[PDB]
Amino acid sequence: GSSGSSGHVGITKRLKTMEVLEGESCSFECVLSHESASDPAMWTVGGKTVGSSSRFQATRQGRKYILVVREAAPSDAGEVVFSVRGLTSKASLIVRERSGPSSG
């Protein structure tokens, strides 16, 4: 019949602000209108490339992505970005120095 598609794809769930305590683990969430399989996804936290790494394990679930961050530091805190097949997002990361008499 008729092959082809006009509908486009975009980010329906733009990143969000994530606040954590210096020395914690934060997992950002990002969903794309489509599975965006054609082209791979990238993860840039603070302003560097992490993608696949021991510390940063950017997992993938169907049409969703979960970037896990280990050993969260105050420096990294700044502005997160997520690019994919061209698209791009932005967010803010907060890291408050540890507190409390307790130890860990």
Swiss-Prot record:
Family: Belongs to the protein kinase superfamily. CAMK Ser/Thr protein kinase family.
Entry coiled-coil feature ranges: none
Originating organism: Homo sapiens (Human)
Cited function: Structural component of striated muscles which plays a role in myofibrillogenesis. Probably involved in the assembly of myosin into sarcomeric A bands in striated muscle. Has serine/threonine protein kinase activity and phosphorylates N-cadherin CDH2 and sodium/potassium-transporting ATPase subunit ATP1B1.
Disease per UniProt entry: Rhabdomyolysis 1: An autosomal recessive disorder characterized by severe and recurrent rhabdomyolysis, usually with onset in the teenage years. Some of the episodes may be triggered by exercise or heat; others occur spontaneously. Rhabdomyolysis is the rapid breakdown of damaged or injured skeletal myofibres and may require intensive care management. Muscle breakdown results in release of myofibrillar content into the extracellular space and circulation, resulting in hyperCKemia (hyperCK) and myoglobinuria.
Whole-protein residues included: 2735 to 2825 of 7968
All copies of domain Ig-like, residue ranges: 9-96
Protein name from the UniProt record: Obscurin
Subcellular location: Cytoplasm, Myofibril, Sarcomere, M line; Cytoplasm, Myofibril, Sarcomere, Z line; Cell membrane, Sarcolemma; Nucleus
Post-translational changes noted in the entry: Autophosphorylated by protein kinase domains 1 and 2.
Source organism, top-level taxon: Eukaryota
Membrane-spanning parts: none
Subunit structure: Interacts (via protein kinase domain 2) with CDH2 and (via protein kinase domain 1) with ATP1B1. Isoform 3 interacts with TTN/titin and calmodulin. Isoform 3 interacts with ANK1 isoform Mu17/ank1.5.
